[PDB]
Design a binder for these strands. Structure first.
Lengths: 443, 249
DNA sequence: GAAGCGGCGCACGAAAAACGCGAAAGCGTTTCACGATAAATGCGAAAAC
C-alpha cells in the first residue's frame, strides 16, 4: 500500500521534498550506467564526481528504493497521568464560570496535592484543551446554537423593525423612545414606507403596508417576508384596539406571506436626545433634552429620503454607481402592478374590540384619547333582525361620526351602522401610591 | 518553447501564486525529460512528425478555420471577437475530430484507421499505473498562504486572467484543529468548486468547497443544524459524566 | 494609577530514522584437479621391392 507512503511524502516539509528532489536525478542517472553494464566503481565515482555526494550513501539508498516502484521513489526519499485530575480540570473549565486557565490549574494543583495526583505541564494541558473541540467551548456556553428565478421590483418586500435610542416627546406629552417599522424592496433596497409609534405593535406594520400599496400599488405576484426565525392592547381611541388576524388581510391583498441609525439616531439636531452607546450616562440631563415628535419625524423622513437617494451603493443593481432610487425607478417601470380600489383600502381601516349589541340593534363606542371625547352610539336594523350578541366594529377615525362597519366575531361582514385625562388620572395616582410606598419600604 | 518555459507574473491570477520548480516534479512522476528532437540511445525517431497535418498544425483546419470562429479569424474586430466558451468548445470538438479522423497515412494506421483506433489498440498493450491522490494534487498550482477564520473558512480574490469574483472556501477540519494560515492548492479551471488545503510545512489537511431556492437551501440548513447538535452531545458524554460528577466541590 | 492572563518564541534532551563503514552471504560465473580415456605419436620388426 502506497497510501501511507504517499501521505508521508505529502506530510513532508518543503525542505524534505526539496531534499528528495535533489537526490532523485542522481539515483536515476546511476541506474542508467548500470544498465549499460558499467562497473559499479566507475559509475559511483562518476556520479560522486559530477554530483557532490557520498558514493556509499547513493549506493545504499539505491538498494533501499530498489524494492519500491519508480514513481514512488520520491515518497521513499522523503502522557500518562491521573485521569481523575484531567477529568477534574476539564470539568472545571466547562463550567459557565470559565475560570482563568492558570488559576483553575493552580486549584487543580491543590486538589492534586490532596489526592497525590501527578499532573502534566500547563502547556501540555492547554495544548490538549485546544485539541478537545470547537464544540466543547460552546458546550460550556451554548453559543454556536444561537448562531448556526427573476425578482421584479415590488415583487418581494421585507418588513423590519427598529428601536430608536433617541428620546422623543410624543404628542401626548410623554417622553419615550419610538419604534418604527419599515418595508423594503428586496431587489433595489429602496425603503417604500414607514410608520413610527410609542411601542411595537401590528398597527405600524399594517399602516406602513397601507402606505406602500397605496403609493406603489399591488403586484400580480406579491411576496412578503417577516423573519421570525400580535400587539393590540388598550385604547388610544378610548376604546380598545384590537385582537385580530392580520394574516388573513395580507393573504386577501394577494400577498404570499413568508416567515439609517446614522441618518436618524445620529443626526446633529437630536444630539441632546440620542445618548449613544454610552454605558455610563447621566439621567439628570435628559428630561430637558428630549426632542419634539415633529422634529424627530421630520429628521426621520429626511433620513429615509437621503438613504434612498444616496449614490455609490455597492450592489449588483447599482453597480457601484447608481442609488437605490435610480435602480428602483428603472426596475419598477418593468414590472406589472395594479392599483388598489377604495373598498380594499377601506377594509384595512382599524378594527375595534368586540362591542355588545342590544336587542334594538345598537351598540356603543366610547370615543376619547387623541380624538374629541364623545360617547358614540351606532345602529342598524340588520343587527336586531338576525342572530348577534357581540360585534367587531371597523372604522376610520375620521369617519367615526358617521359610518362604521359591523362584522361577526368570526369575520363575516354583516352591514354598516350609522351614528344616531380620564384613566390617566388613575394611572398617575397609582404611580404616586407606588413610589411613596416603595421608598418607605426601602427605608 | 522559450516563452512557454517561463511562468507568468505571480499575480496573473490577482492573488499571489507561490513560485516553484516543475523540472523536479516531472522527474519525480517517473518521467525522463528530453530537450531535443530525439531520445538518445533509442531508435524511436523524432518527436515532431514530418507531415504537418499529423501535428498541432493540423488542428487549424478544425479550430482556427472552423465556420463558427470565421468572423474573428485574422489569419497567420472589437465586435467580432468570439466568446471564450465558444472558442474552447470549438477547440475541444476540433481536437475530437482531429483524433477521430480516419484515412491517416501513418505506419500504425496503414492508410485505414484513425489515431483513436490505433491508440485504443496499442494502449491496451502497454503497462501503466494510476496516480495516487498526492501525486495528482502536487501538480496543482500553489497559492500563497491565506488566513483561516475560527469558522474554518478562508478567501481567495479571483481576478487577472480569470473572471473577477471573491471566492470563499470552507471545511469543518479547518475549525476543528490547529490552524491560522493555510496554503491553497488549485486548478484555475476548478477554483469555483474544489481546492486543497495544506499546512505551511506542506501537510495536506483536507479539501475545501466554494460556498424554490431559499426553501431547499433551508432543508439543507436544518439538515446540517441537527447533525451539529448531534456531534455536540457525542463529544460531550465522552469527556463528561464522571468528570462533571467529580467537580461538585 | 496597576496587575494579571493569555499567547508565542527560544532551548534542551532524547528517541527514532540515518549515515558511513564494513563484511559476509547470496550467487553467478569461472576454477582447478584428478583422473581417466583416447589418440597421437614412437619404435621396431617383418614383409615387401
Amino acid at each position: 500500500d502506497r497510501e501511507a507512503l504517499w501521505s508521508k511524502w505529502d506530510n513532508a516539509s518543503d525542505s524534505q521534498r526539496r531534499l528528495a528532489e535533489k537526490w532523485l536525478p542522481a539515483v536515476q542517472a546511476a541506474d542508467e550506467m548500470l544498465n549499460q553494464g558499467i562497473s559499479t566503481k566507475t559509475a559511483f565515482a562518476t556520479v560522486a564526481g559530477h554530483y557532490q555526494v557520498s558514493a556509499s550513501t547513493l549506493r545504499d539508498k539505491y538498494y533501499q528504493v530498489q524494492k519500491f516502484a519508480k514513481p514512488d521513489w520520491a515518497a521513499a526519499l522523503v502522557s500518562e497521568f491521573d485521569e481523575d485530575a484531567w477529568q477534574f480540570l476539564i470539568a472545571d473549565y466547562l463550567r459557565p464560570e470559565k475560570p482563568a486557565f492558570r488559576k483553575c490549574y493552580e486549584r487543580l494543583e491543590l486538589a492534586a496535592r490532596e489526592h497525590g495526583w501527578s499532573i502534566p505541564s500547563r502547556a501540555t494541558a492547554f495544548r490538549r484543551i485546544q485539541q478537545l473541540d470547537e464544540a466543547m467551548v460552546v458546550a460550556c456556553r451554548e453559543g454556536e446554537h444561537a448562531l448556526m428565478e427573476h425578482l421584479d421590483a415590488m415583487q418581494w418586500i421585507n418588513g423590519d423593525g427598529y428601536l430608536h435610542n433617541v428620546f422623543v416627546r410624543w404628542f401626548n406629552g410623554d417622553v419615550i423612545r419610538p419604534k418604527t417599522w419599515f418595508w423594503q424592496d428586496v431587489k433595489t433596497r429602496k425603503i417604500l414606507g414607514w410608520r413610527c409609534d410609542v411601542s411595537e405593535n401590528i398597527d405600524s406594520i399594517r399602516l406602513s403596508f397601507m402606505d406602500v400599496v397605496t403609493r406603489y400599488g399591488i403586484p400580480e405576484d406579491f411576496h412578503i417576508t417577516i423573519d421570525n426565525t400580535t400587539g393590540g392592547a388598550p385604547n388610544r381611541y378610548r376604546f380598545k384596539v384590537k385582537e385580530d388576524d392580520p394574516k388573513g388581510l395580507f393573504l386577501l391583498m394577494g400577498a404570499k406571506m413568508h416567515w439609517l441609525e446614522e441618518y436618524v439616531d445620529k443626526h446633529p439636531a437630536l444630539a441632546g436626545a440620542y445618548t449613544g452607546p454610552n454605558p455610563q450616562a447621566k439621567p439628570d440631563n435628559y428630561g430637558d433634552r428630549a426632542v419634539d415628535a415633529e422634529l424627530f419625524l421630520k429628521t426621520l423622513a429626511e433620513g429615509v429620503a437621503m438613504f434612498n437617494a444616496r449614490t455609490g451603493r455597492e450592489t449588483e443593481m447599482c453597480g457601484g454607481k447608481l442609488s437605490f432610487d435610480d435602480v428602483f425607478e428603472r426596475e419598477y417601470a418593468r414590472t406589472i402592478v395594479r392599483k388598489p380600489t377604495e373598498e380594499q383600502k377601506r377594509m384595512l381601516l382599524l378594527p375595534a374590540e368586540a362591542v355588545n349589541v342590544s336587542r334594538k340593534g345598537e351598540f356603543t363606542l366610547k370615543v376619547g384619547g387623541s380624538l374629541k371625547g364623545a360617547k358614540n352610539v351606532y345602529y342598524n336594523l340588520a343587527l336586531m333582525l338576525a342572530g348577534v350578541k357581540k360585534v367587531v366594529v371597523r372604522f376610520d377615525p375620521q369617519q367615526l361620526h358617521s359610518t362604521v362597519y359591523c362584522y361577526t366575531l368570526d369575520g363575516r361582514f354583516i352591514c354598516e351602522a350609522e351614528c344616531l385625562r380620564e384613566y390617566r388620572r388613575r394611572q398617575k395616582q397609582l404611580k404616586s401610591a407606588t413610589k411613596a410606598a416603595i421608598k418607605a419600604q426601602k427605608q | 518553447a522559450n516563452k512557454w518555459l517561463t511562468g507568468g507574473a505571480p499575480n496573473r491570477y490577482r492573488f499571489k501564486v507561490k513560485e516553484d520548480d516543475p523540472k523536479g516534479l516531472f522527474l519525480l512522476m517517473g518521467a525522463k525529460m528530453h530537450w531535443t528532437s530525439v531520445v538518445a540511445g533509442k531508435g524511436w525517431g523524432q518527436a515532431k512528425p514530418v507531415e504537418r497535418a499529423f501535428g498541432v498544425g493540423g488542428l487549424e483546419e478544425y479550430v482556427d478555420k472552423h465556420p463558427a470562429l470565421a468572423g474573428a479569424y485574422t489569419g497567420p474586430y472589437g465586435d467580432r471577437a468570439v466568446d471564450a466558451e465558444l472558442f474552447l468548445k470549438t477547440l475541444a470538438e476540433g481536437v475530437a475530430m482531429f483524433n477521430a479522423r480516419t484515412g491517416r497515412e501513418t505506419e500504425m494506421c496503414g492508410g485505414k484507421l484513425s489515431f483513436d483506433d490505433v491508440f485504443e489498440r496499442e494502449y491496451a498493450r502497454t503497462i501503466v499505473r494510476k496516480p495516487t491522490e498526492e501525486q495528482k494534487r502536487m501538480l496543482l498550482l500553489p497559492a500563497e498562504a491565506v488566513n483561516v477564520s475560527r469558522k474554518g473558512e478562508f478567501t481567495l480574490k479571483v481576478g487577472g486572467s480569470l473572471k473577477g469574483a471573491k471566492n470563499v472556501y470552507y471545511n469543518l477540519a479547518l475549525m476543528l484543529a490547529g490552524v491560522k494560515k493555510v496554503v491553497v492548492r488549485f486548478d484555475p479551471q476548478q477554483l469555483h468548486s474544489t481546492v486543497y488545503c495544506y499546512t505551511l510545512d506542506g501537510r495536506f489537511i483536507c479539501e475545501a468547497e466554494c460556498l424554490a431556492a431559499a426553501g431547499r437551501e433551508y432543508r439543507r440548513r436544518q439538515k446540517q443544524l441537527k447533525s451539529a447538535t448531534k456531534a455536540a452531545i457525542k463529544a460531550q458524554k465522552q469527556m463528561d459524566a464522571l468528570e462533571v460528577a467529580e467537580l461538585l466541590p
